[PDB]
Ligand binder design. Structure first.
Ligand SMILES: CCc1nnc2cccc(Cl)n12
Length: 209
């Protein structure tokens, strides 16, 4: 059972701007997704200090980066707090509306797309490099879900029957044909070192087989 939803108009407008604007410094998408994973890990770590059973779904707090050239995907996995169905359908977009308005105003005043994370909407930078984004996520208080969007105004949400993940989020970036440099080990290593060198969780870059 797949449910289809319309983005709010303002979020659709943000996604079109990210897809259509000429902007060569695309590599910042990875910093933004790693930052979001770090924030999700911070959140489960803090909650676990008052309820240690919140880690019954997995004690390890980490970020994995997994390129797959055969599927042309780059997957960012974290064992953070995860997202509920309400987060995926309503809550994240509600918060993103105000950050989007502020980001758009900043761009008109001279900011550039690399500053997107200062407005809280860095997730959508994934569309600098991905034609489709699939998010598999599991929060302790809800079931495992898959969110997916190729932009164009709509997204889907379904219960996920694939390999259970325990807790956290996997962001699967289906890369555009001209963005396969982000599958190369040396390129991902360069980007992590430049923009994510002080993240407080282990980041493992998997190697392709
Ligand atoms: C990683 C998933 C995610 N993070 N931020 C947002 C905003 C809207 C929709 C989704 Cl799936 N998001």
């Amino acid at each position: 059972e797949v449910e289809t939803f319309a983005f709010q108009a303002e979020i659709a407008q943000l996604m079109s701007l990210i897809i259509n604007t000429f902007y060569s410094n695309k590599e910042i998408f990875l910093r933004e997704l790693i930052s979001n994973s770090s924030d999700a890990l911070d959140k489960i770590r803090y909650e676990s200090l008052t309820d240690p059973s919140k880690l019954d779904s997995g004690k390890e707090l980490h970020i994995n980066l997994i390129p797959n050239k055969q599927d042309r995907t780059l997957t960012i996995v974290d064992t953070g707090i995860g997202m509920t169905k309400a987060d995926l359908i309503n809550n994240l977009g509600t918060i993103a509306k105000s950050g989007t308005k502020a980001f758009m105003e900043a761009l008109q005043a001279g900011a550039d797309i690399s500053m997107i994370g200062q407005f809280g909407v860095g997730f959508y930078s994934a569309y600098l490099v991905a034609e489709k984004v699939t998010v598999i996520t599991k929060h302790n208080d809800d079931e495992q879900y898959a969110w997916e969007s190729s932009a164009g105004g709509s997204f889907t949400v379904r219960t996920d029957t694939g390999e259970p993940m325990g807790r956290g989020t996997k962001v699967i970036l289906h890369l555009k044909e001209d963005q396969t440099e982000y599958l190369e080990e040396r390129r991902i290593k360069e980007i992590v070192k430049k923009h994510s060198q002080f993240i407080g969780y282990p980041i493992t870059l998997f190697v392709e087989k």
